[PDB]
Structures are given as structure tokens and as C-alpha cells.
Short mmCIF file of C-alpha atoms and ligand atoms in Angstrom, two decimals:
data_model
loop_
_atom_site.label_atom_id
_atom_site.label_comp_id
_atom_site.label_asym_id
_atom_site.label_seq_id
_atom_site.Cartn_x
_atom_site.Cartn_y
_atom_site.Cartn_z
CA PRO A 20 0.00 0.00 0.00
CA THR A 21 2.92 2.37 -0.76
CA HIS A 22 1.99 3.27 -4.39
CA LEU A 23 -1.32 3.34 -6.36
CA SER A 24 -1.81 -0.08 -8.08
CA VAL A 25 -2.25 0.28 -11.88
CA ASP A 26 -4.98 -2.38 -11.54
CA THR A 27 -7.13 -0.07 -9.30
CA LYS A 28 -10.53 0.86 -10.88
CA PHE A 29 -10.87 4.36 -12.41
CA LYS A 30 -14.45 5.83 -12.50
CA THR A 31 -15.05 7.05 -16.10
CA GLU A 32 -18.36 8.98 -15.83
CA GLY A 33 -16.52 12.33 -15.87
CA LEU A 34 -14.64 11.33 -19.10
CA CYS A 35 -17.75 10.29 -21.16
CA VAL A 36 -18.63 13.75 -22.67
CA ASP A 37 -15.14 14.09 -24.30
CA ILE A 38 -14.95 10.26 -24.73
CA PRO A 39 -18.43 8.90 -25.51
CA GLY A 40 -18.79 5.12 -25.26
CA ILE A 41 -15.94 4.78 -22.72
CA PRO A 42 -16.11 1.49 -20.72
CA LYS A 43 -17.58 1.98 -17.28
CA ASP A 44 -15.17 -0.76 -16.10
CA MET A 45 -11.68 0.72 -16.40
CA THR A 46 -8.26 0.42 -14.62
CA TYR A 47 -5.33 2.88 -14.44
CA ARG A 48 -3.44 0.35 -16.66
CA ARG A 49 -6.01 0.58 -19.52
CA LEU A 50 -6.39 4.38 -19.04
CA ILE A 51 -2.58 4.91 -19.26
CA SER A 52 -2.45 2.72 -22.37
CA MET A 53 -5.33 4.80 -23.88
CA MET A 54 -3.32 7.99 -23.23
CA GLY A 55 -0.48 6.59 -25.42
CA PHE A 56 1.96 5.64 -22.64
CA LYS A 57 3.79 2.31 -22.55
CA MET A 58 4.87 1.11 -19.09
CA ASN A 59 6.25 -2.19 -20.71
CA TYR A 60 6.41 -3.77 -17.19
CA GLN A 61 9.05 -1.59 -15.52
CA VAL A 62 10.35 -1.76 -11.90
CA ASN A 63 12.37 1.48 -11.84
CA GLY A 64 10.69 3.91 -9.39
CA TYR A 65 7.79 4.95 -11.66
CA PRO A 66 5.02 2.32 -11.08
CA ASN A 67 2.06 4.52 -12.03
CA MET A 68 1.58 8.04 -13.55
CA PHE A 69 -1.36 8.53 -11.11
CA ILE A 70 -0.84 8.62 -7.32
CA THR A 71 -2.79 8.09 -4.08
CA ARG A 72 -4.37 11.00 -2.16
CA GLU A 73 -1.83 10.28 0.68
CA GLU A 74 1.09 10.51 -1.82
CA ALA A 75 -0.35 13.78 -3.24
CA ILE A 76 -0.60 15.38 0.28
CA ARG A 77 3.06 14.48 0.93
CA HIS A 78 3.95 16.31 -2.35
CA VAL A 79 1.52 19.30 -2.07
CA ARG A 80 4.41 21.68 -3.10
CA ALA A 81 4.45 19.92 -6.52
CA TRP A 82 0.74 20.63 -7.27
CA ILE A 83 -0.19 22.29 -10.52
CA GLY A 84 -3.84 22.34 -11.48
CA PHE A 85 -4.28 21.42 -15.13
CA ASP A 86 -7.30 21.75 -17.42
CA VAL A 87 -7.81 21.41 -21.17
CA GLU A 88 -10.81 22.94 -22.99
CA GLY A 89 -11.68 22.01 -26.59
CA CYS A 90 -11.90 25.48 -28.30
CA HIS A 91 -13.25 23.96 -31.56
CA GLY A 98 -9.67 15.66 -31.39
CA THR A 99 -6.15 16.21 -32.92
CA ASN A 100 -7.96 18.34 -35.61
CA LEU A 101 -9.22 21.22 -33.36
CA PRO A 102 -7.29 23.69 -31.16
CA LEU A 103 -7.02 23.18 -27.37
CA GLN A 104 -6.71 25.68 -24.55
CA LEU A 105 -4.24 24.43 -21.91
CA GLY A 106 -4.83 26.05 -18.51
CA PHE A 107 -2.57 25.91 -15.46
CA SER A 108 -3.09 26.98 -11.82
CA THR A 109 -0.19 29.50 -12.47
CA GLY A 110 -2.83 31.54 -14.39
CA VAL A 111 -1.28 30.67 -17.79
CA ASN A 112 -3.46 29.73 -20.78
CA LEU A 113 -1.68 28.31 -23.85
CA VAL A 114 -3.42 27.56 -27.16
CA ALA A 115 -2.17 24.49 -29.02
CA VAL A 116 -3.06 24.12 -32.72
CA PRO A 117 -2.49 20.88 -34.68
CA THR A 118 -1.75 22.82 -37.94
CA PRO A 147 -5.71 35.02 -16.81
CA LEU A 148 -2.59 35.15 -19.05
CA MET A 149 -3.98 34.24 -22.53
CA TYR A 150 -1.61 33.38 -25.46
CA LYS A 151 -2.52 32.89 -29.21
CA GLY A 152 -2.58 29.55 -31.16
CA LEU A 153 0.82 27.89 -31.62
CA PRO A 154 1.83 24.32 -32.64
CA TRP A 155 2.70 21.68 -30.02
CA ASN A 156 6.48 21.77 -30.72
CA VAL A 157 6.68 25.34 -29.44
CA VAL A 158 3.90 25.03 -26.76
CA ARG A 159 5.83 22.15 -25.08
CA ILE A 160 8.99 24.35 -24.66
CA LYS A 161 6.80 26.94 -22.79
CA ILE A 162 5.25 24.21 -20.55
CA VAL A 163 8.75 23.03 -19.43
CA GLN A 164 9.87 26.66 -18.85
CA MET A 165 6.76 27.50 -16.79
CA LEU A 166 6.84 24.33 -14.60
CA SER A 167 10.62 24.63 -14.11
CA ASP A 168 10.40 28.30 -12.99
CA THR A 169 7.40 27.56 -10.74
CA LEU A 170 8.71 24.39 -9.09
CA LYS A 171 12.54 24.50 -8.89
CA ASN A 172 12.48 26.01 -5.36
CA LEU A 173 9.39 24.02 -4.22
CA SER A 174 9.67 20.42 -5.38
CA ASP A 175 11.59 17.50 -6.94
CA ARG A 176 8.49 16.69 -9.10
CA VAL A 177 5.20 17.96 -10.65
CA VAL A 178 1.71 16.69 -9.61
CA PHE A 179 -0.97 17.52 -12.20
CA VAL A 180 -4.17 18.07 -10.22
CA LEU A 181 -7.14 17.23 -12.49
CA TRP A 182 -10.97 17.34 -12.58
CA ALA A 183 -10.66 15.00 -15.55
CA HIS A 184 -13.13 15.14 -18.45
CA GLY A 185 -11.01 13.65 -21.26
CA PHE A 186 -8.94 16.16 -23.29
CA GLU A 187 -6.33 16.79 -20.54
CA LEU A 188 -5.37 13.08 -20.39
CA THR A 189 -5.33 12.64 -24.20
CA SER A 190 -3.23 15.84 -24.63
CA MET A 191 -0.50 14.63 -22.22
CA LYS A 192 1.24 12.56 -24.97
CA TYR A 193 2.06 15.89 -26.71
CA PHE A 194 4.30 17.20 -23.91
CA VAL A 195 5.05 14.26 -21.55
CA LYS A 196 7.67 11.47 -21.88
CA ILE A 197 7.91 8.61 -19.37
CA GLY A 198 10.49 5.92 -18.54
CA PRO A 199 12.71 4.75 -15.72
CA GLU A 200 13.66 7.09 -12.86
CA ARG A 201 16.70 9.20 -13.77
CA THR A 202 19.08 11.88 -12.47
CA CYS A 203 19.84 15.31 -13.95
CA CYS A 204 22.73 15.53 -16.46
CA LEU A 205 24.14 18.51 -14.47
CA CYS A 206 23.41 17.50 -10.82
CA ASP A 207 22.24 14.70 -8.42
CA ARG A 208 18.55 15.74 -8.41
CA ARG A 209 15.90 13.52 -9.99
CA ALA A 210 15.14 14.25 -13.66
CA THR A 211 11.87 16.05 -14.37
CA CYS A 212 12.52 17.17 -18.02
CA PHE A 213 13.83 15.69 -21.28
CA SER A 214 15.37 17.28 -24.36
CA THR A 215 14.92 15.67 -27.80
CA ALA A 216 17.62 18.02 -29.20
CA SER A 217 20.42 16.74 -26.93
CA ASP A 218 18.95 13.34 -25.82
CA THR A 219 19.55 14.34 -22.13
CA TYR A 220 17.53 14.72 -18.83
CA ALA A 221 17.40 17.59 -16.33
CA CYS A 222 15.87 18.65 -13.02
CA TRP A 223 13.80 21.91 -12.76
CA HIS A 224 17.07 23.88 -12.15
CA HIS A 225 18.93 22.79 -15.33
CA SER A 226 16.23 22.42 -17.97
CA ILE A 227 16.70 25.58 -20.09
CA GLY A 228 15.77 24.74 -23.68
CA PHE A 229 14.33 21.32 -22.69
CA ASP A 230 11.10 20.41 -24.52
CA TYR A 231 9.46 17.49 -22.61
CA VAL A 232 8.01 16.91 -19.14
CA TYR A 233 9.64 13.73 -17.91
CA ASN A 234 7.88 11.32 -15.46
CA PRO A 235 5.19 13.71 -14.17
CA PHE A 236 2.66 12.57 -11.55
CA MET A 237 -1.08 13.21 -11.58
CA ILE A 238 -4.27 12.89 -9.56
CA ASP A 239 -7.93 13.09 -10.62
CA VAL A 240 -10.04 14.96 -7.97
CA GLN A 241 -13.21 13.50 -9.53
CA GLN A 242 -12.08 10.05 -8.26
CA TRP A 243 -12.70 11.23 -4.64
CA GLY A 244 -16.49 10.95 -4.77
CA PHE A 245 -18.16 14.17 -5.80
CA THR A 246 -21.74 14.99 -6.78
CA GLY A 247 -22.10 17.75 -9.39
CA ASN A 248 -19.57 19.68 -11.44
CA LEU A 249 -16.30 21.45 -10.45
CA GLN A 250 -17.74 25.00 -9.98
CA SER A 251 -20.58 23.78 -7.73
CA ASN A 252 -18.24 21.83 -5.40
CA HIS A 253 -15.54 24.54 -5.40
CA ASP A 254 -17.97 27.46 -4.64
CA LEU A 255 -19.27 25.65 -1.55
CA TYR A 256 -15.96 26.52 0.22
CA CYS A 257 -14.44 29.42 -1.72
CA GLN A 258 -15.64 32.83 -3.06
CA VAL A 259 -12.20 34.21 -4.20
CA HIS A 260 -11.83 32.11 -7.40
CA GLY A 261 -14.49 33.09 -9.95
CA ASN A 262 -15.17 31.20 -13.20
CA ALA A 263 -14.06 33.57 -16.00
CA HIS A 264 -14.74 30.51 -18.30
CA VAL A 265 -11.08 29.99 -19.32
CA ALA A 266 -9.08 26.76 -18.77
CA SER A 267 -6.79 28.37 -16.09
CA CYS A 268 -9.91 29.28 -14.00
CA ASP A 269 -10.83 25.57 -13.82
CA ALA A 270 -7.20 24.62 -13.07
CA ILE A 271 -7.13 27.11 -10.15
CA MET A 272 -10.55 25.94 -8.86
CA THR A 273 -9.39 22.25 -9.14
CA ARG A 274 -6.24 22.73 -7.01
CA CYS A 275 -8.24 24.97 -4.59
CA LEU A 276 -10.89 22.26 -4.17
CA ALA A 277 -8.11 19.66 -3.61
CA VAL A 278 -6.37 21.86 -0.93
CA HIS A 279 -9.75 22.28 0.87
CA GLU A 280 -10.23 18.48 0.98
CA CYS A 281 -6.71 17.56 2.03
CA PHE A 282 -5.77 20.49 4.32
CA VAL A 283 -8.96 22.32 5.36
CA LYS A 284 -11.71 19.68 6.07
CA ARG A 285 -9.08 17.00 6.74
CA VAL A 286 -5.99 17.98 8.79
CA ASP A 287 -2.82 15.92 9.41
CA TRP A 288 -0.04 17.55 11.44
CA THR A 289 1.96 14.25 11.62
CA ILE A 290 3.15 14.67 7.98
CA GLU A 291 6.69 16.01 7.83
CA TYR A 292 7.86 18.09 4.81
CA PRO A 293 11.47 18.50 3.55
CA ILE A 294 13.55 21.64 4.18
CA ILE A 295 13.47 23.84 1.07
CA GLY A 296 14.36 27.29 2.46
CA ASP A 297 14.83 29.25 5.69
CA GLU A 298 12.66 26.94 7.82
CA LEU A 299 15.19 26.47 10.69
CA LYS A 300 16.09 30.18 10.84
CA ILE A 301 12.44 31.35 10.72
CA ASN A 302 11.42 28.97 13.51
CA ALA A 303 14.37 29.98 15.69
CA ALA A 304 13.51 33.65 15.05
CA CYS A 305 9.84 33.19 16.13
CA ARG A 306 11.02 31.66 19.43
CA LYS A 307 13.48 34.60 20.03
CA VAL A 308 10.89 37.26 19.05
CA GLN A 309 8.18 35.70 21.30
CA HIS A 310 10.43 35.47 24.42
CA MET A 311 11.56 39.08 23.84
CA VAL A 312 8.12 40.63 23.26
CA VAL A 313 6.31 38.74 26.03
CA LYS A 314 9.15 39.30 28.54
CA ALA A 315 9.13 43.06 27.82
CA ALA A 316 5.32 43.31 28.10
CA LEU A 317 5.34 41.69 31.58
CA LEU A 318 8.20 43.99 32.73
CA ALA A 319 6.59 47.17 31.30
CA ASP A 320 2.99 46.61 32.47
CA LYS A 321 3.42 44.00 35.28
CA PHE A 322 0.20 42.06 34.46
CA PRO A 323 -0.54 39.65 37.36
CA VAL A 324 -1.96 36.94 35.03
CA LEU A 325 -1.18 35.90 31.36
CA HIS A 326 -3.78 33.92 29.33
CA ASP A 327 -1.84 31.80 26.78
CA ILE A 328 -4.39 30.85 24.11
CA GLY A 329 -3.55 28.37 21.37
CA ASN A 330 -1.34 25.30 20.91
CA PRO A 331 -2.30 22.72 23.58
CA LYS A 332 1.42 21.69 23.63
CA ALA A 333 2.73 25.24 24.45
CA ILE A 334 5.45 25.84 27.05
CA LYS A 335 6.05 29.18 28.87
CA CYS A 336 7.98 31.45 26.48
CA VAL A 337 9.27 33.42 29.56
CA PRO A 338 9.96 30.69 32.22
CA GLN A 339 11.36 33.11 34.84
CA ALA A 340 8.52 35.72 34.77
CA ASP A 341 6.57 36.40 38.02
CA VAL A 342 3.04 36.20 36.41
CA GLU A 343 0.34 33.53 36.88
CA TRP A 344 0.66 31.63 33.61
CA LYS A 345 -2.67 30.03 32.51
CA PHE A 346 -2.90 27.88 29.32
CA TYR A 347 -6.01 27.36 27.10
CA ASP A 348 -6.14 24.75 24.36
CA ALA A 349 -7.11 25.64 20.84
CA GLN A 350 -5.81 23.83 17.75
CA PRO A 351 -4.71 25.89 14.69
CA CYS A 352 -7.89 26.87 12.82
CA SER A 353 -7.53 25.94 9.17
CA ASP A 354 -10.97 26.97 7.85
CA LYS A 355 -12.43 30.14 9.39
CA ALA A 356 -10.68 32.18 12.07
CA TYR A 357 -12.05 31.43 15.58
CA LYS A 358 -14.83 33.65 16.86
CA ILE A 359 -13.39 35.23 20.07
CA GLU A 360 -16.75 34.58 21.84
CA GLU A 361 -16.35 30.79 21.19
CA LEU A 362 -12.83 30.74 22.70
CA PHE A 363 -14.45 32.02 25.96
CA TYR A 364 -17.69 29.91 25.77
CA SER A 365 -17.90 27.78 28.92
CA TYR A 366 -21.31 26.04 28.66
CA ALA A 367 -23.07 25.73 32.15
CA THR A 368 -20.04 27.03 34.14
CA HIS A 369 -18.25 30.38 34.50
CA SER A 370 -15.33 30.95 32.15
CA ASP A 371 -11.90 32.32 33.23
CA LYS A 372 -11.72 36.15 33.35
CA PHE A 373 -9.97 37.21 30.11
CA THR A 374 -10.09 40.92 31.08
CA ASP A 375 -7.61 40.32 33.98
CA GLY A 376 -3.97 40.62 32.86
CA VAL A 377 -2.87 40.06 29.26
CA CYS A 378 -3.91 37.55 26.53
CA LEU A 379 -1.24 35.93 24.38
CA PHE A 380 -2.40 34.73 20.93
CA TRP A 381 0.77 33.33 19.31
CA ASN A 382 -0.44 32.10 15.88
CA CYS A 383 -3.95 31.62 17.28
CA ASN A 384 -6.16 33.20 14.56
CA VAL A 385 -9.30 34.91 15.87
CA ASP A 386 -11.88 37.29 14.22
CA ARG A 387 -11.38 40.22 16.66
CA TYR A 388 -8.68 40.29 19.34
CA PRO A 389 -9.39 41.62 22.84
CA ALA A 390 -7.76 45.01 23.64
CA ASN A 391 -5.42 43.46 26.31
CA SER A 392 -3.53 41.24 23.79
CA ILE A 393 -0.07 40.30 22.42
CA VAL A 394 -0.61 38.73 19.00
CA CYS A 395 1.41 36.98 16.28
CA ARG A 396 -0.74 36.54 13.16
CA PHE A 397 0.66 35.07 9.90
CA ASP A 398 -0.11 37.26 6.83
CA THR A 399 -1.47 34.81 4.21
CA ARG A 400 -0.71 37.34 1.42
CA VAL A 401 3.08 36.94 1.81
CA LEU A 402 4.92 35.75 -1.31
CA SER A 403 7.44 33.00 -0.39
CA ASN A 404 8.48 29.39 -1.16
CA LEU A 405 6.92 28.23 2.14
CA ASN A 406 3.54 29.90 1.45
CA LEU A 407 1.38 28.21 -1.20
CA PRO A 408 -1.92 29.65 -2.52
CA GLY A 409 -4.93 28.33 -0.56
CA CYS A 410 -8.75 28.15 -0.26
CA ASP A 411 -11.10 31.18 0.15
CA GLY A 412 -8.31 33.77 0.46
CA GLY A 413 -6.32 31.58 2.85
CA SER A 414 -2.87 30.10 2.32
CA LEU A 415 -1.03 26.86 2.95
CA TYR A 416 2.06 27.63 4.99
CA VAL A 417 4.34 24.59 4.76
CA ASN A 418 7.25 24.64 7.22
CA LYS A 419 7.91 21.16 8.72
CA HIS A 420 4.11 20.68 8.70
CA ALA A 421 1.31 21.96 6.42
CA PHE A 422 -0.87 24.69 7.92
CA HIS A 423 -3.87 26.02 6.01
CA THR A 424 -4.36 29.53 7.49
CA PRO A 425 -7.55 31.63 7.09
CA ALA A 426 -7.39 34.86 5.08
CA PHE A 427 -5.47 37.69 6.78
CA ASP A 428 -8.01 40.37 7.87
CA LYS A 429 -6.76 43.82 9.09
CA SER A 430 -10.01 44.33 11.01
CA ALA A 431 -9.05 41.53 13.49
CA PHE A 432 -6.63 44.13 15.00
CA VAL A 433 -8.92 47.18 15.61
CA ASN A 434 -8.37 47.07 19.38
CA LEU A 435 -4.56 46.84 19.01
CA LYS A 436 -1.58 48.64 17.38
CA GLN A 437 1.35 47.28 15.30
CA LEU A 438 4.20 46.19 17.60
CA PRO A 439 7.31 48.28 16.88
CA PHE A 440 10.82 46.79 16.70
CA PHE A 441 12.86 46.99 19.92
CA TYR A 442 15.60 44.89 21.50
CA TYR A 443 15.56 44.56 25.29
CA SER A 444 18.28 43.05 27.52
CA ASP A 445 18.99 42.87 31.25
CA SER A 446 21.96 40.45 30.74
CA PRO A 447 25.35 41.72 31.97
CA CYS A 448 27.68 43.70 29.68
CA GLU A 449 30.35 40.94 29.19
CA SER A 450 31.91 39.96 25.76
CA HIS A 451 33.49 36.38 25.73
CA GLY A 452 35.58 35.06 22.79
CA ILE A 459 33.66 39.05 14.54
CA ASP A 460 34.81 42.66 13.90
CA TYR A 461 33.19 46.07 14.93
CA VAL A 462 31.55 49.50 14.17
CA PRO A 463 29.92 51.07 17.29
CA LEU A 464 26.16 50.58 17.62
CA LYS A 465 23.97 53.67 17.87
CA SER A 466 20.25 53.00 18.21
CA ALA A 467 17.28 54.33 20.16
CA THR A 468 15.73 50.78 20.18
CA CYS A 469 18.60 49.00 21.98
CA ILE A 470 17.09 48.94 25.48
CA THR A 471 20.13 48.08 27.63
CA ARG A 472 22.01 49.44 30.72
CA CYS A 473 24.96 50.39 28.45
CA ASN A 474 22.73 52.43 26.13
CA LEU A 475 21.06 54.12 29.14
CA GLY A 476 24.62 54.86 30.39
CA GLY A 477 25.63 56.45 27.08
CA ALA A 478 27.42 53.78 24.98
CA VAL A 479 26.33 50.30 23.77
CA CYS A 480 28.84 47.57 24.90
CA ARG A 481 30.12 45.06 22.30
CA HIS A 482 28.09 42.10 23.65
CA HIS A 483 24.77 44.00 23.41
CA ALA A 484 25.76 45.41 19.96
CA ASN A 485 26.33 41.83 18.64
CA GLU A 486 23.12 40.57 20.24
CA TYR A 487 21.11 43.53 18.93
CA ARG A 488 22.30 42.94 15.33
CA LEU A 489 21.53 39.24 15.63
CA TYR A 490 18.08 39.97 17.09
CA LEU A 491 17.26 42.50 14.33
CA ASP A 492 18.30 39.82 11.76
CA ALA A 493 16.00 37.21 13.41
CA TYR A 494 13.19 39.79 13.58
CA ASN A 495 13.49 40.78 9.87
CA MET A 496 13.61 37.07 8.95
CA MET A 497 10.30 36.45 10.81
CA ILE A 498 8.58 39.53 9.31
CA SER A 499 9.63 38.73 5.76
CA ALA A 500 8.43 35.11 6.27
CA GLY A 501 4.90 36.66 6.68
CA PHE A 502 4.43 36.97 10.46
CA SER A 503 2.85 40.21 11.82
CA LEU A 504 3.04 41.43 15.46
CA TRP A 505 0.34 43.28 17.34
CA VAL A 506 0.12 44.61 20.92
CA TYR A 507 -2.22 46.42 23.35
CA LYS A 508 -2.22 50.26 22.71
CA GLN A 509 -0.68 51.18 26.12
CA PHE A 510 2.56 49.21 25.30
CA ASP A 511 5.48 51.62 25.66
CA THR A 512 9.16 50.64 25.60
CA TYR A 513 9.86 53.87 27.56
CA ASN A 514 8.62 51.83 30.58
CA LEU A 515 11.56 49.39 30.11
CA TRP A 516 14.34 51.88 30.96
CA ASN A 517 13.41 51.98 34.70
CA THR A 518 13.98 48.17 34.94
CA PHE A 519 17.75 49.23 35.20
CA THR A 520 18.05 51.07 38.58
C1 AWD B 1 -15.11 24.63 30.79
N1 AWD B 1 -14.95 25.98 30.26
C2 AWD B 1 -14.22 26.00 28.98
C3 AWD B 1 -13.99 27.41 28.44
N2 AWD B 1 -13.53 28.35 29.47
C4 AWD B 1 -12.59 29.33 29.47
O1 AWD B 1 -12.10 29.70 30.54
N3 AWD B 1 -12.28 29.98 28.30
C5 AWD B 1 -11.38 31.08 28.28
C6 AWD B 1 -10.28 31.08 27.42
C7 AWD B 1 -9.33 32.09 27.47
C8 AWD B 1 -9.47 33.07 28.42
F1 AWD B 1 -8.53 34.05 28.48
C9 AWD B 1 -10.51 33.09 29.31
C10 AWD B 1 -11.45 32.07 29.24
C11 AWD B 1 -14.24 28.23 30.75
C12 AWD B 1 -14.25 26.80 31.24
ZN1 ZN B 2 20.07 19.46 -12.22
ZN1 ZN B 3 -10.95 28.64 -4.64
ZN1 ZN B 4 25.74 46.15 27.45
#
């Protein structure tokens, strides 16, 4: 049960308008043969072009929605749509291109997939709502065979060039003309009633149907993300390291200890309400405060209503108005005024953040997290948290070169005394680096309106 058996049944109802008379009884083996691909009994890492839902979820970074619309059967032109927004027109003689023959269209397909996926994945997963023409068009731009490595590196081969007779990964495929060993999944095989638009619109209002192939390709991948990451959640699935994952995660831990520690020193709240991850540990273990935890899993569909986080049924809830409330990646519709918040901005463009469902995004860093759409109005009772570095640690160096630090946001005894010491200058520069890393990864920081770093200077007396 590792791969999808080629002898598994494939439901053909969705294919019978493009392919009338298609056998109701069909396997992946006969379907693949129909598409013009010869597996010839091969045990070399490519058992099936199609993959299980579990295998697709593990390779969510490789997903590219694909749809083909029949503009006019190898005699009429086809519109090729991709979830990148690209529409190509292939002739057999929202980015829309005019009619060109397959030999030139296939060069553009390789270029587009290579530029989209080189920093995300080792493969491509064509996400379909299969009706017929997309499967029968694959023979015009896809070549299959045994698993291979790139001619210029150790990465698996994803492209093929008929000009040079060589194979390349997404990084070294310039001028390559064929997609080599792609994977695919038909969303219609999951058990849906009704067409694509009707099932998609049930969960998302951000992707309209402008009636082009790329609209369907976007809606297809969106519907798939909703089913695999919104309605169904699995935080036990690990994902490879493709970018600044370790640095971003380390930065969030530094930023959270800093911000929370300074809030408790500046306003001396007697109680802190830590709302969110049921596995959370105190970010400031030495603070005086009564630390009270509240369990709430990451919301992947809609942001939590704040009234439901405080709903206690037939008993009195804890008093949230006493002290401060810490919402570290705990997404709510409207934060209370006495809060410290970290809220991921789903609009951020990065290799970790994939487009999601209903304005939301799929942030993949060790685990996959579908996050609801970022909404500025959640923060009406708060203000943006400004950058500051605080330290009560002694001014001692131990064991890099130097330019003296001058900054109003270095809250240390040395700065109060007139001149930043070398230890606090190094630590400040490191902390600013960690902070900028976290902000550029998409995280946004918010705090109660009375927060004032001027209150931190008297903690040195
Ligand atoms: C059995 N109930 C469960 C909910 N509940 C509660 O206390 N919620 C709450 C969360 C965060 C906060 F800050 C205050 C209250 C009351 C007891
Ligand atoms: Zn390579
Ligand atoms: Zn959508
Ligand atoms: Zn110092």
C-alpha cells in the first residue's frame, strides 16, 4: 500500500462527454495505455503516472492544477490552462496566449513548470478534474520511462530534451522540450456529486469562473487543498527543508520570548492567558506572572470567533479581562484590547507559502498549515508592535569585527549609560536579523495600545 496499483478501478463517468462510449469498467493500466503511454512492465521507481491521495498530500508543493478545454480531437485547437494563471493555445496545424503548434507550446510548458517548481519540489503533480482532453493531450508534452538523475546534478530528472537526448531537473532544464515522469491525480475520483464549480464554490468565493481553462485549473487545485488540508488535517506529515525553515522557527522563538518578557516587565500584568497550541510551554519561564494555558488547535478553515474561545457552557469561564492575553499564531476574528498577537499574513509571497482556499494560504514549514485569510479588522483594538531589542543580561563579551552601535531601540544598561557595549551590539544585530527574517516570512506582530518601551528603561536602577 505504498503506491497506487495500476490495476485499481478508475471511475469514467466524468470522461464520457469528451470520450463517448468509454467502458464503465476501467483500470489505471487501460487508461494509461489509452493515453499513449507504454509502461512495458518496468520496476524502476515509476510504477504509475497517477498517485494516491496520501502521496499527493506528501507532495503538495508539486501541485499544478491542469485543465484542457476544446476550443473547436487532434484536428481542433485546445486551450491548456494551469493553476499558475497561464493559458496556452495548441493548434495541430488570466494570461492568454494565441494559437501555436505543439512543438513550441511544449517548450513553454517546461519553462513554466521549471520556474514555478525549482524552489518548491523534486516533481510535478498535475491536479485534475478529468473530463477527457487533458489526459489525451499529455502525450504531446510528456515522456515517461525509468527514474533518472539530472545531467548537471544529483537531483531527480523532471525534463527531457529531444535536441540533446539528455535529462534535467527543474534547475537545469533551459531549452528542454518534454516533461519527464510527471505525476497526476484526478479529484473526480474522490467521490463528488455535481460539477467542479458547484463543489468549489461551496468553500471558496475568491476564485471566480471567468470561463477559461486556467480558471478551472485554479478551482481544481483549490478544491483539492480544501479536501486535504482544510476539512481534513494531518499535522503528523513532515515536509522536507526547502528554504529558511530552521532560521524562521528559531527567530519566532526569540521574538516571542523578547516581546512577552518586555510586556510583563513594562505593564506588570498579574496573570497571562496563553491561548492556542495545547502543547505550548512558557515562552518566559522566569517571569513572576500567573501563567494560565487554554487549548485551541490551529484553525484551518475560518478564524475562531473570540466569543467561542471564551464559551464555557453551564459554568463560569476564566476572566480574560484580567492581565494580558497571548495569541501566538492563534487566529481569531477580533482580538481583545489586552492582547499580544502573532498573526501570519497569508498574502506573503514565499516558497513556504502556497496559494490556498477562500483567500487563505497553505504555509508549509515542517508541517502543512492552512491559514484563514489575513483580515486587518481583526486588530482594531490593538496597534502594530514596533521593533525593539531589550536586555537585562550583563555587559560581558566572551571570545567578529566592529563598528559602534547607535540605536534608540537598543534597550540596555549600556545604552542608558551612554554607549552600547560590544556584547549588546552583537546581540542587537543578531536579534534584528532574526526579527526581519520572521517579518519577511509573513508573520505580523500586534500589541495592546498602552505598550510603551519607555517603561523598560526603569527596569535598570
Ligand atoms: C469549561 N470551560 C471551557 C472554556 N472556558 C474558558 O475559561 N475559556 C477562556 C479562554 C481564554 C481566556 F482568556 C478566558 C477564558 C471556561 C471553562
Ligand atoms: Zn540538475
Ligand atoms: Zn478557490
Ligand atoms: Zn551592554
